C-alpha cells in the first residue's frame, strides 16, 4: 500500500527494473531523476528531499556525512550485502569508513569520448587516442576546435585530471598548483573548447555535433549505443588514457528523514540480487559493484575494457580526495575564470 521515492541519475536503471520491482512486491515506486551532485546535493543541505532513496557520488556523500543528512544502513535488512564486491567497498570506505552508509551501485571513469573517424581525419591515422595529449595538449586541441570540444562543468574532476597530466599529485592540497600550471594549461587550451556541460556532450556526440569530449564512460558508451542504433554513420569511442584517470563510485542512500525505510531495504536487496544489477548494466553501459554480477552481464558489455577496464588500467586509476575550505574555494574560484575569458 505504502510508496518508495527513489532520486537517481539520468538513464540510470534498465526500463523495466522498478516494474519488474513493483510486481514482486506490491510496493509502487515513484522515480525521479537528477544529472548533477550539486543539484542533489542543494536538495540534501537545503531541507527535506522528500525521497527515502537516493544516488550521491561517493566523494560527495562523504562531505554529506559530515551533515548527518543521512541514515546509517541496516545491514542486517540486506542479506546480499555479500554479492558485492570486497575490493570496491575498500574503496567506497575511504569516504564512507566502514560501509555504514551507501550501498555501492555503479562506477566508471572521467575520460576522453571521441568522433573515431574526425579525430582520424584530424590528427591522423595514429591519432594519440590513448592518452590525455589528445584532449589537453594545445595543438591538438586547436585542430581539433573547428569540430567541436567539450568539457565537463566538473572543477573537482578537470583539475585532478590536469594535475595528474602535469605529473602533480590528482589531489593536491597546493592552491598553487590549482591557480598555477593548472590555470595556465586551461587557459591555454580554453580558445579551443565550445561549451563547459556534463550532459549536453552525450547527444553531441551521438549526433556528430562534436568530435571529442571529457565526460564519464558510461555516458560516452550510451552516446554510442545512440550512433549506432540510428545508423547515422556516427562512431563513438572512449578511452581511459594511459597516463591515468579518475574513478567514480556512484552508491545508494538513505536519507535521514525517509519515510518508507522498509520498502527502501526491499529495493536495496532487490539491486543486490545478481541478475537484477546485471541487466541494469545491459541498458545502461555501467559497469556495476556487484562481484557475483559480473558473469551475467552481457558480453557486450563485459568485454568492453571501457566500462569494465582490466588491472592493468585500474591499477592507475585515481580517485578524488575531499578537499579542505581553502583548496574548495580557490579550486571553485579559478573554475569560474576559466570559463569566462
Ligand atoms: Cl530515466
Ligand atoms: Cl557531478
Ligand atoms: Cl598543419
Ligand atoms: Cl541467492
Not at 556516427?234 to 552508491?251: C, H, L, Q, R, T
Request: aromatic share 10%; proline share 6%; net charge negative.
Amino acid at each position: 500500500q505504502k510508496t518508495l521515492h527513489i532520486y537517481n541519475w539520468s538513464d540510470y536503471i534498465a526500463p523495466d527494473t522498478v516494474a519488474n520491482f513493483e510486481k514482486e512486491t506490491g510496493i509502487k515506486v515513484v522515480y525521479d531523476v537528477f544529472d548533477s551532485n550539486e543539484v542533489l546535493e542543494g536538495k540534501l543541505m537545503a531541507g527535506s528531499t522528500g525521497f527515502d532513496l537516493v544516488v550521491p557520488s561517493a566523494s560527495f556523500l562523504e562531505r554529506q556525512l559530515t551533515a548527518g543528512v543521512f541514515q546509517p544502513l541496516d545491514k542486517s535488512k540486506l542479506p546480499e550485502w555479500k554479492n558485492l564486491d570486497p575490493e570496491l567497498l575498500k574503496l567506497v570506505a575511504k569516504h564512507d569508513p566502514d560501509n555504514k552508509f551507501a550501498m555501492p551501485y555503479m562506477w566508471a571513469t572521467t575520460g576522453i569520448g571521441y568522433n573515431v573517424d574526425k579525430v582520424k581525419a584530424v590528427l591522423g591515422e595514429n591519432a594519440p587516442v590513448d592518452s590525455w595529449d589528445l584532449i589537453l595538449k594545445p595543438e591538438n586541441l586547436e585542430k581539433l576546435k573547428s569540430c567541436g570540444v567539450s568539457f565537463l562543468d566538473a572543477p573537482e574532476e578537470v583539475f585532478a585530471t590536469v594535475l595528474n597530466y602535469l605529473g602533480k599529485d590528482p589531489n593536491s592540497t597546493k592552491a598553487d598548483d590549482y591557480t598555477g600550471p593548472a590555470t595556465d594549461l586551461l587557459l591555454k587550451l580554453r580558445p579551443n573548447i565550445r561549451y563547459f556541460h556534463s550532459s549536453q556532450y552525450i547527444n553531441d556526440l551521438a549526433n556528430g555535433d562534436i568530435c571529442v569530449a571529457i565526460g564519464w564512460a558510461g555516458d560516452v558508451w550510451q552516446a554510442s549505443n545512440r550512433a549506432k542504433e540510428a545508423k547515422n554513420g556516427v562512431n563513438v569511442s572512449f578511452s581511459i588514457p594511459k597516463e591515468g584517470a579518475m574513478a567514480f563510485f556512484d552508491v545508494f542512500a538513505m536519507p535521514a528523514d525517509a519515510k518508507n525505510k522498509d520498502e527502501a531495504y526491499q529495493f536495496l536487496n532487490y539491486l543486490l540480487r545478481p541478475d537484477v544489477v546485471a541487466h541494469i548494466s545491459d541498458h545502461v553501459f555501467y559497469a556495476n559493484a556487484n562481484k557475483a554480477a559480473t558473469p551475467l552481464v552481457s558480453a557486450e558489455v563485459r568485454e568492453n575494457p571501457g566500462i569494465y577496464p582490466p588491472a592493468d588500467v585500474r591499477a592507475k586509476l585515481f580517485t578524488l580526495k575531499v578537499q579542505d575550505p581553502k583548496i574548495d574555494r580557490v579550486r571553485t574560484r579559478a573554475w569560474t575564470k576559466v570559463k569566462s575569458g
